[PDB]
A and B are shown apart, each in its own frame.
Chain A
Amino acid sequence: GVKESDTGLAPSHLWDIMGDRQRLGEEHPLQVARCTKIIKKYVINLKQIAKFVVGLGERVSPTDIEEGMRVGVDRSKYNIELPLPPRIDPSVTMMTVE
């Protein structure tokens, strides 16, 4: 068999103290969405096709929210927590760089 060989090794035991209080936090998941219209509040379109009006987070600047940018929104009642960089089509273009 593979007899139970999983990456991590000897430093990941000290990581288990730090990573168990964060893993239970809802920091993650943030269902990744994408803005379709800033209405001078914000309109996101989920990538499941179902549209929602959300609002500002804990302390995000109103400059971060831009057109066609992806953002992460609270898993339950949708509200922008953390904006995220743009476009998820780049990835066939990062394997061409030597």
Chain B
Amino acid sequence: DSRVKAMEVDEKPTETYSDVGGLDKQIEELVEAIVLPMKRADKFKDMGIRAPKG
């Protein structure tokens, strides 16, 4: 459908997670939840854990 094709990436410029003042710990947990079970999907498969759905 045409609403979903617009929702698709358009490359929004990053603001960078280092320019977001304070809140050090919140960046790590977010990185733990979304970014690292995509890239390192071998170490979840050796261990035998599932990836957090969201």
Contacts and interface: CB of A to CB of B under 8 A. Distances in A.
Nearest to B3: A68
B2 to A, nearest CB: 4
Contacts of A68: 2-3, 5-6
Interface residues of B, number: 5
Contacts of B3: 68
Nearest to A34: B2
A35 B6 CA distance: 12
Nearest to A68: B2
A36 B6 contact: no
Contacts of A34: 2
Contacts of B5: 37, 67-68
Contacts of A67: 2, 5-6
Nearest to A38: B5
Contacts of B1: 36
